[PDB]
Amino acid sequence: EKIAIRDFQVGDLVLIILDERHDNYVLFTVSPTLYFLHSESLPALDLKPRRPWVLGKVMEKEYCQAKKAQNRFKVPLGTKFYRVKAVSW
């Protein structure tokens, strides 16, 4: 039970935590880059859209940029962030 904390790769064990400010689950990280949990992964991890954290394994990652100031991630226009699919460990 040792977790990655940045530069996340497929196969990494990660801690998925609730981020109230961004109203989403994210990967716990020491980097300022946000790694949001992809909404598709919530059922697999027995989470809902609360459990404060769960351990998971990264399955897929996609790099995104906010094109609108009003967005589901509550990030500024132009923010680059990741969406990560994960499964329970």
Partner: peptide
């Protein structure tokens, strides 16, 4: 259209 893959 809120975000796009880069």
């Amino acid at each position: 259209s809120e975000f796009e893959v880069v």
